[PDB]
Design a protein around this nucleic acid. Structure first.
Ligand SMILES: Cc1cn([C@H]2C[C@H](O)[C@@H](COP(=O)(O)OP(=O)(O)OP(=O)(O)O)O2)c(=O)[nH]c1=O
Ligand SMILES: Cc1cn([C@H]2C[C@H](O)[C@@H](COP(=O)(O)OP(=O)(O)OP(=O)(O)O)O2)c(=O)[nH]c1=O
Ligand SMILES: Cc1cn([C@H]2C[C@H](O)[C@@H](COP(=O)(O)OP(=O)(O)OP(=O)(O)O)O2)c(=O)[nH]c1=O
Ligand SMILES: Cc1cn([C@H]2C[C@H](O)[C@@H](COP(=O)(O)OP(=O)(O)OP(=O)(O)O)O2)c(=O)[nH]c1=O
Ligand SMILES: Cc1cn([C@H]2C[C@H](O)[C@@H](COP(=O)(O)OP(=O)(O)OP(=O)(O)O)O2)c(=O)[nH]c1=O
Ligand SMILES: [Mg+2]
Ligand SMILES: [Mg+2]
Ligand SMILES: [Mg+2]
Ligand SMILES: [Mg+2]
Ligand SMILES: [Mg+2]
Lengths: 274, 276, 271, 259, 257, 271
DNA sequence: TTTTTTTTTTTTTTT
């Protein structure tokens, strides 16, 4: 029902000291113009194909799970449960686990696998999802029934597969689920084809209207983060982060540069100056 | 019946061109020269890109109409909850940014300045909010107009009430909602601000890069530019704060075009008039 | 039966052949379509803000005072007091509603009632104050009042393609049966490529919202195009799109608007 | 049974094979589809205002003065008086319902009336299938023209099957007019867009159950709005289709004449 | 449809080494291995493309070259027109279109008996019993039906036709019409026909056995240069573009070029 | 579906305790690490530059030399033609290039020696010809117990964007959670400007025709470039365009085409 | 408890 503005004296008070930003890792130019992430705050993450969307969000989920105490729930749909679990273990132990059979055969026999397991999953902070209406119900049981603080979804086009009406209704339902709940919602979508010139995977600067499916994805999201790297140029591991849209602050543009470490799998804050 | 002879209609005209008319905008001077304010029974539709000041400019207008003029103003803001839009108005009235600083929130918690800034604004029943199927939204707007008596009702983000209901074709539901909304506005005679988005251009620049928005760029139907009485478009190029105003269609006068310029003050949050 | 041979028709042809209602502004209309005729349906087409109701209000004024014909307006787009004030101001050469320094001036000067019965003195103008009910009210205007012209401002909000085909067939049947000059206004569709109509794109007969039978059952189509965000948003172009009683179509004339008064008055503009 | 061998058929073929009704204006029609024949269904289709009924009224005139066949008109679009006044003005070479001085100058009205109604040729029309069966059995009509099919998918397919069955039963030349569909991309038909056989409202039976289709295309908002292009879209007897010729209108007279 | 590697033990040797044949652009029966009994052969194209011309040419070439008893069902016209057309097609002279020659040749019985002297053809001016009589009491090995557009009610009819053909074993040709294209060109200006373009229901391509189609740019540069497409063939599987025919307006025979 | 990370104590241990490598070119092996359960490998080239040659060659080398069940579903040609291609390529002859060779093999009984050397171990399966296809491939994977499944010529299998998007989504969701290497053969779209693909244009990642889902659901993307008009028309260039597992893309290596046995060999071309 | 025509609006690609 409707509300009267004198009954909001006791609740705006309670909202005033409750809101709290959750900082990003890997680049400090993101945190200075976003002030983190709050309860009821849909964050769209995008790049070209294979430019590093799942690795970045997996690093963010790792840093919010073992360093800040936040209970993080994932719904990675590109991959299975054990694949992303082994990638989390190999990333928290600063190596490249699944891309080497020698290390996987080594760490299973000397008994240090339980040492690398219980340093993460001992506190029970991470949660995973096993693969339109049942998805949001299981996210609601993930939030209220368990108690997670950040909920991550990946590769939104599985849910829609008329696409524009369904993706608009889906984006509306995810924004309405994020609001009145108190959970950061990280959403990943891809970019359509470039019309002329070069491509987004060759380093073409991403604009805001390339979020494929509708134009309703940039109109129900709060913070839109875009990554881009030129795999054909001179430095194929130099990503650029661009804030396309920020509703809470209004500061957008080039955040900063990062460098990816092929031996550890961590992308780390670079000192690159254009 | 309902067929009116134009001879037995004298007294109504004697009580129509006597009294209303007025209720000017704020932030830019050249807007009020063209549209001559907002009137009862009209529909004013404000459009921009994404995150481009179509809620900040309307909150900055709803402050000036509900405080400095005594008009009871209702806000169906459906993008955010009631706790944030009632808290950004306190900062805008006191010329700060209360949500964008955790230092000032703790400062007004400690010394008790929050009660001063709360009873300065919400002391008189002027701002009427709502927290959250299109046959209940207009029911709540009728309960606001008939029961509480708002003089300016602002419906923000009309795209959330066309997509939260199960309908096959989107254009017919937009047209039916728009004509029922104009009927409610003309029946009750309340000023009605509607906020909606724009669609993707086919090629060239985008709306967030300096694209001059035309009247055909309204997203959803063609019933948006045919059933509204005043259309205001706000345009910027992220000088990422200089927002200019275009009047697209005024039914009352004939003046449409480049109204003027506004600027956004980063520490306070106001739309000051500019000069260029 | 209902068959009639062509030999036994000497009388009814003799009483049928034993120019029409002229227009106002841009003198190449009644040069081209030769005015309106009893039992037609006329479509007035433009984009939003281009002056459709502004154009037809003037014709309702010139057909209700200088010609004496009983006129019935049906403005579903507005109310009765606003169109009554606009008629009073349009006949008195003063833009009435758009100036508040004169609205209270003429009501204490006493010349409001001098301006009222000067044009509303006869029983000429009849207004409609808000589908089958609409047809019954148009029939009550035709039978119970004897209207010579009936104007309808907005066809679209009658609709709660088939419901528009049935509507246009029923209105054409009413116009052919009673012989009343019926003017109906409609809007244009959203084009897929290029400019809108409001930036001065010329209108084709395809651009009609709802269906395509709006052009198949009317007898003439008058389109008005004006460059709204341009160097002059007052000069309009009038294009006659269809004429079944003469045949000639194309660009007829031009009407400047003369912002001080409000009369669409013709101009010279070659190319 | 109804089975008939091909050998017991020598009689009924011998009486059968021992051109038809020509057209006036655009002489590459009867050069191409060899004119009209009995039992058929003919479609003359174009856009609104392109000049369909002017063409078919000229053909109704020329099939009742030089030929003498009983012509039954069915103009559900307008009145029975206007369609006769146009025939009188078209025969008398001076346009009638547009010069208002001549309408009271002629009132030699009966001299113009009886000169073209001195026979019992024409029959106008003021359920519709029963009226056409009456016009065919009790009146001997050789040509029947129908201008308005629209107010008369499934209920259009049934109507077209019933009209084809009536034409097959009676052997009457039958002209039917319907309109074009609304094109969703590109120009309108009225600025010179050539008509495809898809461009027909209602359903697809209008091209499946007829026997020939004639289309007129003219650039209406152009420099020459009085020059129709005539296009044959279908002909079961010949197969010869395409662009036929060009007719000028001659506003002064009203006669579609070739050039 | 999943074939193991052992099941081609002799069949590749079968690659290392028919029925009724078709006329014109001889890669038809080179691709579908000719017509066979028990089949339901569909010839579907646009209006004016020449379905009746094609199937009438095949009805002539299956009654003079083979001598098999042929039954026609030309419900699109009458029994005299479809006989005059066969006589004119056999005698290399376009008959019903030339006004002078129709009264010049009336040698009429000489042209009649040379092609109708046997008991080959069986024409037609309830329908299931008529088809069963034309099979059983008349010995017809080929039955042709030209108009099904006037005869759930199409699915029942097609199941009943297919059960009749299964019970008998007769070559059966049925012609229906295409659907209206929703976007692009029409079938008559050179748009290639897909298998989905069939009216009524979807069982027309699921209870048939082979489908032939024709494409020609009718309002075009050369409207007499057709292209033939095979859309389905349960025996072979070889589908696609078959060949080219010109019409030869003076004669009426679809001759290959 | 709601999974706590505490019950993964023994499942992850089961997952740790495998790449299937590419033959004929070690340059593909240097930057792909083979193929694991759920590794969709998209293969493409120009207009006739040898897609099915290379994919059938890898199917031949994975079956008769490594003991993996390979299921082909070649839809360019039928079952007998791809069986003739398998046997004539494994026996290193040009089978369909001369009629004199097809006659010699059947007169001396040495054809029956060539069925036993390949098809006797049941390490190959074929397919005889979209929602009717996945239920067959699921029984091919689960019921037979195969490991590699190949699909060819996607253009006949598939608004041609929603179809190929749903197809690619269904194939990726089938390859996941089942454990198959699903090789998918696609095409390239036609070049607008510059040089053509028959002349040696460097291929781009956005030339996968039909949608953009062909590079956004793949795990590995391999393309082939051959200049059939240039200096060496028998020289192909293998280019990795996408890798999810490693991320190392570019010119993998070179292979040389042969007009004597039909094969293509590893090359040593320098630039 | 199935199949064909008409029409206005948002996206992704095609020779
Ligand atoms: C960020 C980054 C990743 N990589 C490598 C390591 C990652 O495992 C691999 C990409 O893995 P992902 O990030 O998981 O792939 P993606 O989500 O960007 O694309 P898609 O879902 O469409 O397949 O690329 C680099 O080589 N350089 C880089 O800078
Ligand atoms: C007008 C303007 C706003 N801003 C800031 C003010 C606000 O904090 C923020 C705009 O937030 P909102 O007003 O909420 O954004 P919006 O209504 O225009 O669109 P949407 O709801 O689809 O996102 O940007 C600028 O930085 N520069 C400007 O010129
Ligand atoms: C014709 C014309 C109108 N006008 C202005 C004066 C009128 O007060 C104002 C109103 O135009 P309207 O006549 O009301 O325009 P419309 O009815 O076609 O649009 P809609 O009903 O969809 O809203 O237009 C001009 O300024 N110049 C002109 O040339
Ligand atoms: C063919 C032609 C017609 N005309 C005009 C003159 C005639 O008065 C007019 C005839 O109008 P109609 O032919 O009666 O219009 P219509 O029948 O196509 O439309 P509807 O669907 O409503 O029945 O066409 C020309 O001016 N030049 C021409 O070349
Ligand atoms: C195939 C072909 C036919 N024709 C002509 C010869 C025929 O007399 C004319 C008609 O062909 P028909 O075969 O008679 O057409 P149809 O009976 O199948 O039509 P529908 O069922 O759709 O009503 O087409 C050509 O001119 N060129 C050609 O290539
Ligand atoms: Mg990914
Ligand atoms: Mg907003
Ligand atoms: Mg109006
Ligand atoms: Mg007509
Ligand atoms: Mg036929």
């Amino acid at each position: 029902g409707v509300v009267s503005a004198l009954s909001l004296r006791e609740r705006i008070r309670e909202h005033l000291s409750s809101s709290v930003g959750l900082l990003f890792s890997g680049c400090t130019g993101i945190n200075d113009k976003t002030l983190g992430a709050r309860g009821g705050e849909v964050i769209m993450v995008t790049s070209g194909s294979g430019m590093g969307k799942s690795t970045f969000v997996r690093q963010q989920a790792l840093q919010w799970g073992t360093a800040m105490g936040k209970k993080v729930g994932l719904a990675m749909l590109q991959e299975s449960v054990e694949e992303t679990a082994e990638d989390l273990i190999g990333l928290h132990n600063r190596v490249r686990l699944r891309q080497s059979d020698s290390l996987k055969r080594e760490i299973i026999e000397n008994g240090k696998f339980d040492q690398w397991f219980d340093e993460l999953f001992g506190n029970d902070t991470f949660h995973l999802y096993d693969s339109t209406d049942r998805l949001l119900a299981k996210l609601a049981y993930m939030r209220s029934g368990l108690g997670c603080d950040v909920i991550i979804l990946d590769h939104i086009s599985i849910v829609v597969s008329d696409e524009r009406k369904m993706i608009d209704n889906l984006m509306t339902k995810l924004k309405g689920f994020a609001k009145s709940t108190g959970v950061v919602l990280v959403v990943i979508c891809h970019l359509k084809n470039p019309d002329k010139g070069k491509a987004h995977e060759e380093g073409r600067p991403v604009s805001i209207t390339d979020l494929r499916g509708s134009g309703a994805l940039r109109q129900l999201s709060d913070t839109i983060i875009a990554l881009e790297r030129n795999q054909q140029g001179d430095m194929p591991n130099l990503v650029l982060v661009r804030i396309l849209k920020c509703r809470f602050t209004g500061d957008t543009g080039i955040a900063g540069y990062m460098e990816y470490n092929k031996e550890t799998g961590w992308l780390e804050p670079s000192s690159y100056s254009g």
